[PDB]
Design a binder for this molecule. Structure first.
Ligand SMILES: [Ca+2]
Lengths: 71, 72
């Protein structure tokens, strides 16, 4: 319903991007996620009634990557 | 004598990569030791400067997929 761009630092293998996508995509309200390793971003399609970019960033950071919401 | 160089390494996020970097870089000719700090995002390398340069070490670390810069 909404889309957010999140900068994620230190994504340096495929396995981590899949972990990130796997974990984030399974959160309630998260419809879709695509990570770009080249950009260092995750684009997330989410339901703002349920989840926010700030909580997505927090979830990425609980996985151990520095993150910040871009837009 | 051997020289010491400090290399900042961006994007180390796991113990496994640390071990990989140390394992591969240590094998390079002229590299006595390398101590990677996951905490500080750096590597200290004790190396023979007649055999290998900091720029060569930086490049080798970058070939492993981490952005690296020689600091000191
Ligand atoms: Ca070590």
């Amino acid at each position: 319903c909404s889309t957010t761009l999140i900068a994620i630092a230190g994504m340096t293998c495929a396995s981590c991007v899949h972990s990130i996508e796997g974990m984030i995509s399974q959160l309630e309200g998260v419809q879709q996620i695509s990570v770009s390793l080249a950009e260092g971003t995750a684009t997330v399609l989410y339901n703002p009634a349920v989840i926010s970019p700030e909580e997505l960033r927090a979830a990425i950071e609980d996985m151990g990557f520095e993150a910040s919401v871009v837009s």
